């Protein structure tokens, strides 16, 4: 059993993934903004995180960077709403890059990878 924190803007998009990873064999606790994604990581135990970028509060870019400085061995998968080929400077601090398409069979392979 593993527990993941998945963070995104729209309420309709979060509910879609929660029940896609609970199919594979996980439990999803959903967070909304980057300022509440931080609080949902500090006083607990989470082995992975999925993040967007263009969001109210702060940018998922800067958000991931807050997870890196605190927890040195944190697992950061980026999956913003505008995804291509990992091309911004900040993402090299983050671990793996996922491309958002209706295709969910890329993230599954890479969430599975970064847990061994």
């Amino acid at each position: 059993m593993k527990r993941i924190l998945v963070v995104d803007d729209e309420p309709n998009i979060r509910e879609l993934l929660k029940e896609e990873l609970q199919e594979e064999g996980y439990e999803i606790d959903t967070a909304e903004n980057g300022e509440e994604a931080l609080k949902k990581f500090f006083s607990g135990n989470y082995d992975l995180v999925i993040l967007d970028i263009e969001m109210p509060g702060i940018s998922g870019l800067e958000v991931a960077g807050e997870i890196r400085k605190k927890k040195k061995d944190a697992k950061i998968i980026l999956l913003t709403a505008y995804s291509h080929y990992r091309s911004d400077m900040s993402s090299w601090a983050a671990d793996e890059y996922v491309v958002k398409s209706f295709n969910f069979d890329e993230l599954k392979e890479k969430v599975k990878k970064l847990l061994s």
């Binding site: 879609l16 896609e20 209706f102 295709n103």
Partner: protein, 334 residues
């Protein structure tokens, strides 16, 4: 009313009497259609190639009476503005003939194209991107549910509301996106006189069945029931459609919508006020550019603003917001 030597050293004119036959083919008319007065004199106007409608316009003018100004008419390589004006002979006062006036236009619309369209490229860059993003978002849901519903198999039918409507909310966004994609590709414009309120009602008529659903204390006032305007009916039509559209759910359930058409000496003011959540100082203009809400005004800016002229702005009031525009009766004032 005399002289008629002067008659022919200006722009261009054509007379269609009670069939569609020409009595005077202006000298500048020749210089546009390649043929001289005499070898076209007293001929029918639909007879000419690539031509057509010009007649069909004069036709329904013969039947509806009231004249028209057109703007934007492609004839071959040139764009056009035309002016229709049916008249009568005072000695008879019968239903006599039609005056088609043509303005020398191209060395104009092509030189107010490049101060428009060359700037239309730019926003269709940043926005093309920023909104092209808003595309995938429900795309990944609608496509994603197809890789979600197809392994049950066959649900208790309850997966129809959550399939169609979420597919549907992007679909009319595709619309309200292509509709903005229009805002690049065009540029027809068709000016007519008509009672605004006669339009005002007309719109509400269509919506009715739904406004009737959301038990809405609709309210329409005006200080004048006789209100005419020269403008593109077909089009200032949409404008209404979409204030109304927004002030539909924008006030939503047990919500209220107030329309107001107030006559002013030279110009008219139509306003759609609804109640509920206003919008702040910053968004007074900052919803004008393509930008949507938690809408898609866009076109509706340039429709009033750039097509007819005037303004289409908004304000807060009465714990609600209003959508106001103003266009002079006759655009001939510009």
């Amino acid at each position: 009313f005399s002289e008629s030597i002067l008659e022919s050293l200006e722009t261009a004119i054509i007379t269609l009497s009670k069939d569609g036959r020409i009595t005077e083919w202006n000298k500048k008319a020749e210089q546009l259609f390649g043929l001289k007065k005499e070898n076209v004199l007293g001929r029918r106007l639909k007879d000419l190639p690539d031509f057509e409608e010009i007649g069909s316009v004069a036709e329904s003018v013969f039947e509806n009476k009231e004249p028209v100004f057109l703007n934007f008419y492609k004839f071959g390589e040139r764009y056009f503005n035309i002016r229709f004006s049916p008249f009568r002979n005072a000695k008879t006062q019968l239903l006599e003939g039609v005056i088609i006036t043509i303005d020398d236009v191209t060395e104009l619309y092509k030189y107010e194209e490049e101060r428009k369209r060359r700037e239309r490229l730019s926003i269709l860059g940043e926005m093309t991107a920023r909104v092209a993003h808003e595309i995938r978002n429900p795309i990944t849901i609608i496509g994603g549910f197809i890789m979600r519903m197809k392994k049950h198999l066959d649900d208790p039918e309850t997966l129809k509301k959550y399939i169609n409507i979420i597919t549907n909310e992007l679909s009319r966004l595709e619309t309200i996106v292509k509709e903005i994609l229009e805002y690049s590709k065009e540029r027809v414009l068709e000016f007519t006189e008509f009672n605004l309120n006669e339009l005002i009602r007309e719109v509400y008529v269509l919506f009715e069945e739904k406004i009737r659903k959301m038990n809405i204390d609709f309210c329409f006032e005006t200080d004048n029931e006789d209100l005419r305007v020269e403008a593109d009916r077909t089009r200032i039509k949409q404008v209404l459609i979409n204030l109304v559209q927004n002030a539909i759910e924008a006030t939503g359930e047990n919500g209220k919508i107030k329309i107001t058409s107030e006559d002013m000496y030279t110009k008219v003011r139509v306003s759609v006020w609804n109640s509920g959540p206003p919008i702040p100082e910053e968004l007074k203009e900052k919803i004008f550019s393509p930008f949507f809400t938690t809408l898609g005004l866009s076109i509706c800016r340039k429709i009033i603003e750039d097509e007819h002229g005037g303004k289409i702005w908004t304000e807060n009031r009465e714990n609600g917001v209003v959508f106001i525009f103003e266009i002079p009766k006759t655009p001939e004032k510009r």
